[PDB]
């Protein structure tokens, strides 16, 4: 099955124009004018943005444009803005079958953001305490979320989800410290440390 | 003008049959300008065309990587079409979308997938569904559910700030937890009611928790 090749990632700053390539053969892109493009935000259904190479369906703004040259089709986004950060897929008719491209992640370049929420009265009433460390808005995607409590590295109950090739949201990450009661009232735990290529944000937040 | 509404279980046991349904509104499935497609997406991967049906086509049009395990049925009086995958394996876990594919022989949206269902996430596991316990964060996090996903809203969509919902975390017990963060005026707290609406479709559980 001869597929459609897209770059894994493309980035630009707000207001710029960017282009996404989609390379097939003469039996798909080059054989037919029935190339289309789709936008997909994380955790949401794809959305048609271009069809018949160059045409916009209803509701799609003129910042999206399509073209093709020989066996490669291109999606151009003008006036990049934060809402354009998303995955983009091309598709083509072939011989009858359809094929999607491998997908391109568009990053709009616009200090990791760390948000700490300590265990609440309702949780602790329910014999369960959870430390909520939520990080967002960092690029590139590699971040290391470590934990400490009592100035002491603790890892008994640490669950961590960071972006990977096999995740939907590549710009946010989560980490929780679940644990038995009174370990939060034992002392002024805790601190959530997050490393991001030399950018170490250790946020200490202690409930009492 | 068209809407596709998907249904079907979010949890299938291994070796059993996945059955997903797509109710079409705005065009008859017998309309010969359109093909009816199923597409799937593994976690973090790209879109994979599974196959399509065409009302006057009895031929099997399937992605050969499916290895002939998927078929389709149509309920015309319900204007509905259903994907069945037999003897499912862990590799069948994915989000499944139904979509309308306009024929190349028509101008409007010709050759493209111009309307999409909202998707159904399918987990293949022998573990049993568990509805969540939702915890208000005074003055919100959803804990100990299986399988994914959960959706969270506030005051039935009438609250939209910021808002971001963060990835779930998986515990050693095999259950998930997550949270979605929001902020509101500090003066309008003790008087206005804040209800979080958590929908865990796999357990068909909806829970509204006053905060």
Author numbering:
A (entry chain Q): 1 to 9, 11 to 27, 28A, 29B, 30C, 28 to 93, 95I, 95J, ...
B (entry chain P): 1 to 35, 35A, 35B, 36 to 52, 52A, 53 to 82, 82A, 82B, ...
From the paper:
In this study, we isolated the neutralizing monoclonal antibody CAP248-2B, and used structural biology to characterize its epitope which spanned both the gp120-gp41 and gp41-gp41 interfaces in a manner distinct from other antibodies. CAP248-2B extends the interface target to include the gp120 C terminus, effectively encircling the base of native pre-fusion trimers. CAP248-2B was predicted to be derived from the IGHV4-31 and IGHJ3 heavy and IGLV2-14 and IGLJ1 lambda chain germline genes, and displayed modest levels of affinity maturation, with 13.5% and 9.7% nucleotide mutation in the heavy and light chains respectively. CAP248-2B possessed an average length CDR-H3 of 15 amino acids, but had an unusually long CDR-L3 of 19 amino acids.
We determined two crystal structures of the unliganded CAP248-2B antigen binding fragment (Fab) to resolutions of 2.0 Å and 3.1 Å respectively. The CDR-H3 and CDR-L3 loops of the 2.0 Å resolution structure were influenced slightly by crystal packing, and a comparison of the CDR-H3 between the two structures revealed a potentially dynamic loop that flipped between two distinct conformations bent at residues Gly100D and Gly100E to flip the Asp100B and Asp100C anionic pair ~180° between CDR-L3 proximal and distal orientations. In both structures, the angle at which the CDR-L3 extended from the Fab was stabilized at its base by germline conserved hydrogen bonding interactions with CDR-L1, as well as a salt bridge formed between CDR-L3 residue Arg95I, and Asp50 in the CDR-H2. Structural analysis indicated that the CAP248-2B paratope was conformationally variable. Divergent CDR-H3 conformations that were only seen because of crystal packing may represent a level of plasticity that could have evolved to better accommodate Env sequence variation. Conversely the additional flexibility observed for CAP248-2B may contribute to its low potency.
